[PDB]
From a paper:
Herpesvirus-associated ubiquitin-specific protease ([name], also known as [name]), a deubiquitylating enzyme of the ubiquitin-specific processing protease family, specifically deubiquitylates both p53 and [name], hence playing an important yet enigmatic role in the p53–[name] pathway. Here we demonstrate that both p53 and [name] specifically recognize the N-terminal tumor necrosis factor–receptor associated factor (TRAF)–like domain of [name] in a mutually exclusive manner. The crystal structures of the [name] TRAF-like domain in complex with p53 and [name] peptides, determined at 2.3-Å and 1.7-Å resolutions, respectively, reveal that the [name] peptide recognizes the same surface groove in [name] as that recognized by p53 but mediates more extensive interactions. Structure-based sequence alignment of the three [name]-binding peptides revealed a conserved four-residue binding motif with the consensus sequence of (Ø/E)-G-(Ø/G)-S, where Ø denotes a non-polar residue.
We succeeded in the generation of crystals for this [name] fragment and solved its structure at 3.2 Å-resolution. The structure contains two well-ordered domains, the TRAF-like domain as a β-sandwich and the isopeptidase domain as a tripartite architecture. Interestingly, there is very limited interaction between these two domains, and the intervening linker sequences (residues 199–206) have high-temperature factors in the crystals, suggesting that the substrate-binding domain is coupled to the catalytic domain through a relatively flexible linker sequence. In addition, the ubiquitin-binding pocket of the catalytic core domain and the substrate-binding groove of the TRAF-like domain are located on the same side of the molecule. A conjugated ubiquitin moiety is bound by the Fingers domain of [name], with the C-terminus of ubiquitin docked in the active-site cleft between the Palm and the Thumb. The close proximity of the C-terminus of [name]-bound ubiquitin and the [name] peptide suggests that [name] likely prefers to cleave the ubiquitin chain at the proximal end of the ubiquitylated [name]. Second, the linker sequence between the TRAF-like domain and the catalytic domain is flexible, which allows some lateral movement between these two domains and hence enhanced access to multiple ubiquitylation sites within the same substrate.
Numbering used by the authors: 64 to 104, 113 to 219, 222 to 501, 510 to 551
């Protein structure tokens, strides 16, 4: 019943003498009544109805479709069109008002009719729908998150599925604490339930630990910061525990920003750590072109001339260079910027392409054979709306096997590659802003095996008490 797609027919007898709208007998997909509609307007109507008879206002299903009119003389001569649409009561029906010229669907000389009967065919491609109890933990084995903290959910999951971090986090000494203050703890919950629950997991108490309340302290930052609040937070806690320095060992990299005055002999090198990488896009085509630009060399002149002390203002070069690329690579694409002419905080939906395999040791001044620097796509945080608000999802293939899933809040579905990748490449309206890549040699480690027997014990217990009390 809850199939992911299908095809169904509906034939209208006594057509020419038609006066009103005819609803077909329901076909089910994703557990929803998808019906066909035919009504004149002279032209021939053709739409697809979707669970229009349900009262509810809290439900939604997206879907592709092929409204097809069969040719009783040859199938390849049939006339059909394509439609994509978001369905929900207020707009439970989509299609075409001028689906075909009535004078052509009635010309007995070209098939479409026989006994003045016309046969309509509709191939629907349904996604998982919200507001209709979707047992994520069933046809995905993965559970979801509620609400939408905006981008926090995506980040949360993206993190949960960074296994090595997960175990390490579990193993924290979170006893002497206060269940509403302790972030590490407040995260140990999410992670735990995120694993054992069958019902949406409640961000609720985590959202408090940072202070990020009321939700404008969510729009007042971005993934990067949250990632850095949660993360950095968890380590000053892993600071004396057998799982010490786990985070940097997973996400940290050593960068180098330099300067070497052109005419005079003076250089200034500064290695800095880094837990992510902000890549530019506006004007670039793919990731490989972003790195190229990132490691381009900026000249200092005019007002930009370099402050050189005993040398005074001088002419120099300035640029950055990588020394090491983390095991886990957080790449944030800058699509969110401040327009010049407006006062607007605008989003750039231009087209940017990321690949499944990333070649990257050719951007370090010194590479190490035996241990290349090649990452593989692991997560794609998407966002929709040319507006700075909207909706946050996140695609992943948790065990890095190439098998994907969409974590749209409490609706985790199985999906194709071209849906997480080739589908989030901008658009000249819905796309990706962040990415997670894991190095090819450290995959198996970063994505270790999870067992109910990794979580402390006394922890499963504390998490238990609090869940008996009131």
């Amino acid at each position: 019943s809850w199939r992911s797609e299908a095809t169904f027919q509906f034939t209208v007898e006594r057509f020419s003498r038609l006066s009103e709208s005819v609803l077909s007998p329901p076909c089910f997909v994703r557990n929803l009544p998808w019906k066909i509609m035919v009504m004149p307007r002279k032209s021939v109507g053709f739409f697809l109805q979707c669970n229009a008879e349900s009262d509810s206002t809290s439900w939604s299903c997206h879907a592709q479709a092929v409204l097809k009119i069969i040719n009783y003389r040859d199938d390849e001569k049939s006339f059909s069109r394509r439609i994509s649409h978001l369905f929900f009561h207020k707009e439970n029906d989509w299609g075409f008002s001028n689906f075909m010229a009535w004078s052509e669907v009635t010309d007995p000389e070209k098939g479409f009719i026989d006994d003045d009967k016309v046969t309509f065919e509709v191939f629907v491609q349904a996604d998982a729908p919200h507001g209709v109890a979707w047992d994520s933990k069933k046809h995905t084995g993965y559970v979801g998150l509620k609400n939408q903290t905006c981008y926090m959910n995506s980040l949360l999951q993206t993190l949960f599925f960074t296994n090595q971090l997960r175990k390490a986090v579990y193993m924290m000494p979170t006893e002497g604490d206060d269940s509403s203050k302790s972030v590490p703890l407040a995260l140990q919950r999410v992670f735990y339930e995120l694993q054992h629950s069958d019902k949406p997991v409640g961000t609720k108490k985590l959202t408090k630990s940072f202070g990020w309340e009321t939700l404008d302290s969510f729009m007042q930052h971005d993934v990067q910061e949250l990632c850095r609040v949660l993360l950095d937070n968890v380590e000053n806690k892993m600071k004396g525990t057998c799982v010490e320095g786990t985070i940097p060992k997973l996400f940290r990299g050593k960068m180098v920003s330099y300067i070497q005055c052109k005419e005079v002999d003076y250089r200034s090198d500064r290695r800095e750590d880094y837990y992510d990488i902000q890549l530019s896009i506006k004007g670039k085509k793919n990731i490989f072109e972003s790195f190229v630009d990132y490691v381009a060399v900026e000249q200092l002149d005019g007002d930009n001339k370099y402050d050189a002390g005993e040398h005074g203002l001088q002419e120099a070069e300035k640029g950055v260079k990588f020394l090491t690329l983390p095991p886990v690579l957080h790449l944030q694409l800058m699509r969110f910027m401040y327009d010049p002419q407006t006062d607007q905080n605008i989003k750039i939906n231009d087209r940017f392409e990321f690949p499944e395999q990333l070649p990257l040791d050719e951007f370090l001044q010194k590479t190490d054979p035996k241990d290349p620097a090649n990452y593989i796509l692991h997560a794609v945080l998407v966002h929709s709306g040319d507006n700075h608000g909207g909706h946050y999802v996140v695609y992943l293939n948790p065990k890095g096997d190439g098998k994907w899933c969409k974590f749209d809040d409490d609706v985790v579905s199985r999906c194709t590659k071209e849906e997480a990748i080739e589908h989030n490449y901008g658009g000249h309206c819905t796309n990706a802003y962040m990415l997670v890549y894991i190095r090819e040699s450290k995959l198996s480690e970063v994505l270790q095996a999870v067992t109910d027997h990794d979580i402390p014990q006394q922890l499963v217990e504390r998490l238990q008490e609090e869940k008996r009390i009131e």
